[PDB]
Amino acid sequence: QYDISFADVEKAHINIRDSIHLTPVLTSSILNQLTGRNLFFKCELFQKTGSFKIRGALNAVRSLVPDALERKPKAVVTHSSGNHGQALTYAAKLEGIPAYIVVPQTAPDCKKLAIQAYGASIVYCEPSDESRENVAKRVTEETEGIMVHPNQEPAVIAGQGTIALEVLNQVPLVDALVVPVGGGGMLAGIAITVKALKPSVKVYAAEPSNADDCYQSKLKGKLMPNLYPPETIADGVKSSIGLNTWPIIRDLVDDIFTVTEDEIKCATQLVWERMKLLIEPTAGVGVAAVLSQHFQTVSPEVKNICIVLSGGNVDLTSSITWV
Amino acid sequence: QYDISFADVEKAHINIRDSIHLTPVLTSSILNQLTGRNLFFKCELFQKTGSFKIRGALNAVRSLVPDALERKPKAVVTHSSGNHGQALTYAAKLEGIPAYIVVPQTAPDCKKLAIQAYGASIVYCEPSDESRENVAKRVTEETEGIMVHPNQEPAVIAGQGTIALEVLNQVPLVDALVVPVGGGGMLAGIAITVKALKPSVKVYAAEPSNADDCYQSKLKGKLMPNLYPPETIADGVKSSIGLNTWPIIRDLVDDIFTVTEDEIKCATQLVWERMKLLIEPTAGVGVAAVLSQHFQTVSPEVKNICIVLSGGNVDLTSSITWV
Numbered sequence: 001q002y003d004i005s006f007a008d009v010e011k012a013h014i015n016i017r018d019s020i021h022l023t024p025v026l027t028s029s030i031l032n033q034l035t036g037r038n039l040f041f042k043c044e045l046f047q048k049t050g051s052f053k054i055r056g057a058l059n060a061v062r063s064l065v066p067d068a069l070e071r072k073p074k075a076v077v078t079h080s081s082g083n084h085g086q087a088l089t090y091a092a093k094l095e096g097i098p099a100y101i102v103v104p105q106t107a108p109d110c111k112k113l114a115i116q117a118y119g120a121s122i123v124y125c126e127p128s129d130e131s132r133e134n135v136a137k138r139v140t141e142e143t144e145g146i147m148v149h150p151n152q153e154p155a156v157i158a159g160q161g162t163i164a165l166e167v168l169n170q171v172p173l174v175d176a177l178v179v180p181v182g183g184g185g186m187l188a189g190i191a192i193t194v195k196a197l198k199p200s201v202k203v204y205a206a207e208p209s210n211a212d213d214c215y216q217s218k219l220k221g222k223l224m225p226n227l228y229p230p231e232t233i234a235d236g237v238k239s240s241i242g243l244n245t246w247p248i249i250r251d252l253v254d255d256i257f258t259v260t261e262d263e264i265k266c267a268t269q270l271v272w273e274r275m276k277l278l279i280e281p282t283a284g285v286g287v288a289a290v291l292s293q294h295f296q297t298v299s300p301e302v303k304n305i306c307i308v309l310s311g312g313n314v315d316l317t318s319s320i321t322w323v
Numbered sequence: 324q325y326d327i328s329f330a331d332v333e334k335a336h337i338n339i340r341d342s343i344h345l346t347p348v349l350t351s352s353i354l355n356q357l358t359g360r361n362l363f364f365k366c367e368l369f370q371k372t373g374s375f376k377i378r379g380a381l382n383a384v385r386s387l388v389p390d391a392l393e394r395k396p397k398a399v400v401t402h403s404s405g406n407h408g409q410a411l412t413y414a415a416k417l418e419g420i421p422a423y424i425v426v427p428q429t430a431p432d433c434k435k436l437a438i439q440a441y442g443a444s445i446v447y448c449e450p451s452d453e454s455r456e457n458v459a460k461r462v463t464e465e466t467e468g469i470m471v472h473p474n475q476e477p478a479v480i481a482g483q484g485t486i487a488l489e490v491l492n493q494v495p496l497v498d499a500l501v502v503p504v505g506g507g508g509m510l511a512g513i514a515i516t517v518k519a520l521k522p523s524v525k526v527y528a529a530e531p532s533n534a535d536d537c538y539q540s541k542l543k544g545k546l547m548p549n550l551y552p553p554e555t556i557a558d559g560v561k562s563s564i565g566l567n568t569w570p571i572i573r574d575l576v577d578d579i580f581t582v583t584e585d586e587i588k589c590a591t592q593l594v595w596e597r598m599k600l601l602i603e604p605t606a607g608v609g610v611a612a613v614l615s616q617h618f619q620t621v622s623p624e625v626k627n628i629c630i631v632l633s634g635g636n637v638d639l640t641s642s643i644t645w646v
C-alpha cells in the first residue's frame with residue numbers, strides 16, 4: 001500500500017538497535033499544569049548525533065544497496081548539511097565507509113567548517129539544482145555510494161518510525177503522539193507504526209505557520225509543497241512533504257496544528273527554562289502545538305500525549321540572537 | 324554521632340517523597356569516553372524548583388515548628404532569592420502558607436519582579452545586616468513562621484541525604500558519588516546515607532579552587548572557612564562549610580577535588596553541548612572534578628561514578644559572559 005509497512009519499521013529497529021540510544025521519556029508538572037494535558041517528552045535530543053535522524057540514516061546505510069551488482073554501499077552521499085548530514089556521516093563512520101556532502105559554493109564558511117568537523121568530505125556544486133543533482137548523482141556513481149534523501153527515502157522513513165515503537169513501549173497508556181513535520185519522514189514512519197499497532201492512538205503533526213505546506217496539503221487533499229523557501233526559526237522543518245510521505249500523512253495522520261514564530265520561540269524558551277532541556281527551536285514546534293489555541297479542540301479523552309523532542313543541535317554561541 | 328543520623332534521612336524520605344520528583348539518572352557515551360569511567364548523572368536539575376534544595380526545604384517546612392502555640396508553621400521567611408529561597412517558597416506553596424522574602428528597599432526593580440514571579444511576598448528592610456536580621460526576626464515572629472538555614476539546619480541536611488537513597492537504588496553497582504560542596508548540607512546528607520547503607524561506596528566532594536575551604540579543612544583536620552567571600556562562577560557553592568556539616572565531612576567523605584574556574588566553565592559548556600542539559604555552573608563543578616587531572620589517578624576499581632547535577636537555575640539572558 002504505502003512506501004513502507006510496519007514490517008519495514010521493525011526491520012529498521014532490528015537493524016539499528018545496537019547503535020542508537022533508547023532515549024528516555026521525561027515529564028514536567030509545569031507543562032502538565034499549563035496545557036491541560038498529561039505530557040510525556042520523548043527525548044530524541046539525547047539521541048546519538050543530537051537528533052532522531054541517526055535512526056533513518058543508519059537504517060539506510062545498513063539496508064540500501066548501491067547497485068544490482070553490489071550488495072554493500074561503499075560511501076554515502078547527501079545534499080543535506082544539517083541534522084541529516086551529521087547523522088548520515090556518523091552512520092557511515094560506524095560502517096567504515098566515507099561520507100560526502102554536496103554543498104553549494106555559496107554555503108556559509110561556518111557550515112563548511114561544521115561539515116568537516118563532523119568528519120564528512122565536501123563536494124562543491126553550483127547554487128543551482130541542475131548542478132546539485134549533477135554533482136550528487138555523479139559522486140554517488142563514482143564512489144559506488146548510496147544517495148540518502150533526508151525524508152523521502154523509504155529506508156529513512158522506516159528508521160524514523162522506530163521512535164513510535166519505543167514510545168508505545170515506554171508510555172503504555174499514551175493517547176496521542178505529537179510530531180514536528182518538515183519532509184514528513186518522521187511523521188510518516190511514526191504514523192505507519194502507530195496505526196499498525198494501536199490505531200486508537202492519535203497521530204498529530206505540528207508545523208510552523210510560516211512553512212505550512214503539510215497543513216495546506218491536508219486541507220486541500222493533495223500535495224501542495226511550499227512555493228518558496230520558508231523563513232522560520234524552525235530550521236529543521238523547512239523541507240516540504242514529498243511524494244513518498246504525503247500519502248501516509250494524508251491517510252494516517254489525525255490532524256495538523258500550525259504555530260506562529262512567536263509560539264515556537266516561547267515554547268522553546270519554556271522548555272529551556274522549565275525543563276532544562278536544550279532543544280533546538282525545531283523541537284519546540286511540537287510543544288508550541290500542544291500549547292496553541294487550536295489544540296483545545298482536541299477531545300478531553302485524549303489525555304496522555306507524548307511530544308517528540310526531535311533534536312538538540314542548537315548553536316548557543318551564534319544562533320542565539322532571538323532571545 | 325552528628326547533627327543527623329541515617330534515621331533522619333529515612334524520615335525525610337517519608338516526609339517529602341509524595342511531593343518531589345524521583346529524578347532520572349542519565350548517561351553520556353562521550354563523557355564516559357573522556358573520563359575512562361562509567362558515569363551516571365543524577366539529574367537534580369529536573370527537580371522541582373530547578374535544584375535539589377526542595378528536598379531539605381520541604382523536610383524543614385514539614386518538621387520544624389514556630390515559636391507559637393500552633394505546632395505548624397504559618398509562614399516561611401527567608402533572605403534568599405536564589406535556589407534556597409525558591410525552594411522554600413515552593414515548599415510554602417505546597418503547605419498553603421505565605422513565603423516572605425526580606426529585601427533591602429534599594430533592590431532593583433528587575434530583582435523584585437523576578438522574586439514575585441516565583442511567588443514570594445516581599446517585605447522591605449534597610450540595606451544593613453542589622454536591619455535585614457531584625458526585619459526577618461520580626462516577620463518570623465509576627466507571622467508565627469520559621470526560618471530555615473540553607474545548609475546547617477539538621478532537617479535540611481537530612482532531606483538532602485535522600486538524593487543518595489535514590490542513587491543507590493537507581494545505580495545498584497555504583498562505586499562513588501561526586502557531590503559539589505558549598506555549605507556542605509548536600510555533601511553531609513549524602514555522606515551519612517552512603518556510609519550507612521553501602522560504606523564501600525566512595526563519597527567525593529568537588530569545589531572551586533577559588534573557594535577551597537573544604538579541601539583545606541580536610542587537609543588540616545579542622546574547620547578552616549574561606550577568609551573572605553570567594554569569587555567564583557559557581558555561585559551556589561560560595562558558602563563555607565559550617566559547624567554542623569564539618570564533622571560529617573571530616574569523618575565520612577573520602578576525598579575532595581578542586582577545580583579551576585576554567586575547568587568549571589569548560590565542564591558546564593561540555594554538558595550543555597554534548598548532553599543537552601542546561602545545568603547551572605555550580606552543577607558543572609562535579610563534572611569538572613571527574614574530568615580533572617587529579618581524578619584521572621583515582622583507582623580504576625572505582626568505575627561506576629554518579630555525579631549529582633545539582634541544579635539548572637541559570638540566567639539564560641546572561642550566559643554570554645563566559646561562553
Ligand SMILES: O=C(O)Cc1ccc(-c2ccccc2)cc1
Nearest residue numbers: 400401402403407470471472473
Ligand atoms: O535567609 C535564609 O533563608 C538563610 C538563613 C536562614 C536561617 C539562618 C539562621 C541563622 C542562625 C540561627 C537560625 C537561623 C541564617 C540564614
Ligand SMILES: *Cc1c(COP(=O)(O)O)cnc(C)c1O
Nearest residue numbers: 083182183184185186236310311
Ligand atoms: C529533520 C528534523 C525534523 C523533521 O523531520 P522530517 O522527517 O523532515 O519531517 C524535526 N526536528 C528535527 C530536530 C529534525 O532534525
Ligand SMILES: *Cc1c(COP(=O)(O)O)cnc(C)c1O
Nearest residue numbers: 406505506507508509559633634
Ligand atoms: C545549594 C547548592 C549547592 C551546594 O549545596 P550545599 O549544601 O550548600 O553544599 C550545589 N549546587 C547547587 C545548584 C546548589 O543550589
Ligand SMILES: [Ca+2]
Nearest residue numbers: 066067140145
Ligand atoms: Ca547506484
Ligand SMILES: [Ca+2]
Nearest residue numbers: 211212213214
Ligand atoms: Ca512544512
Ligand SMILES: [Ca+2]
Nearest residue numbers: 530534536537
Ligand atoms: Ca568551598
Ligand SMILES: [Mg+2]
Nearest residue numbers: 002003243244
Ligand atoms: Mg512512492
Ligand code: NA
Nearest residue numbers: 017018019020
Ligand atoms: Na546501544
Ligand code: NA
Nearest residue numbers: 064153154155
Ligand atoms: Na529504500
Ligand code: NA
Nearest residue numbers: 165166168169
Ligand atoms: Na512497542
